[PDB]
Amino acid sequence: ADERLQFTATTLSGAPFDGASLQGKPAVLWFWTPWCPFCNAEAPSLSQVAAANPAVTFVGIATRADVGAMQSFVSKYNLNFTNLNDADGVIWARYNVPWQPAFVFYRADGTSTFVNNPTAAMSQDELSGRVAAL
């Protein structure tokens, strides 16, 4: 929320990205790793919900994998939004780690809600409703 978004990063494509650009608009952070079965179950839903909600800015944040594996996952699931190679877990630490998948749902006013459930993948219906609520 608010100042935690003040990070910089590198995308899987190698481009710089500034988290501060997310301030003041509805956004979703999604912390994933490519080998997690829950992340793999959620990825089609991220792809569809992001596509259907273009005025919400989605940013995936991947760690604990090589960049090629990250890229294969984005390609396989058509994740057409920024994905960050958080190679050393610094952004993950900022948002307090602990494992994947995790969502942060930001309103434009800076408030947020998190979902970090280890037992199940979030359904598309649930994700669509959380994104609409922003």
Side-chain angles (χ1 to χ4, degrees):
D2 253 286
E3 204 149 13
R4 295 180 299 173
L5 289 168
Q6 323 229 207
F7 59 86
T8 61
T10 299
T11 74
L12 305 187
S13 291
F17 177 80
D18 181 1
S21 70
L22 295 170
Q23 294 177 143
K25 61 169 97 151
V28 175
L29 306 181
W30 183 54
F31 294 84
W32 61 270
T33 69
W35 39 258
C36 167
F38 300 94
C39 292
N40 278 82
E42 289 182 351
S45 295
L46 273 294
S47 178
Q48 286 295 120
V49 178
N53 295 89
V56 176
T57 303
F58 285 70
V59 180
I61 306 174
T63 193
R64 291 194 81 188
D66 55 276
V67 185
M70 296 172 173
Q71 289 177 344
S72 288
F73 180 96
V74 164
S75 292
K76 176 176 179 181
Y77 298 114
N78 199 1
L79 304 181
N80 184 29
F81 49 83
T82 298
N83 284 277
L84 302 181
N85 175 11
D86 185 30
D88 296 331
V90 168
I91 305 166
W92 281 58
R94 178 185 267 271
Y95 276 89
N96 195 25
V97 296
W99 2 251
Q100 88 285 143
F103 295 83
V104 184
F105 291 98
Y106 276 105
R107 295 185 67 89
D109 70 2
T111 67
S112 64
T113 52
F114 176 75
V115 177
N116 184 27
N117 179 9
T119 68
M122 189 183 291
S123 67
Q124 189 180 164
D125 277 12
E126 177 177 331
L127 179 60
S128 176
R130 295 176 174 282
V131 168
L134 310 174

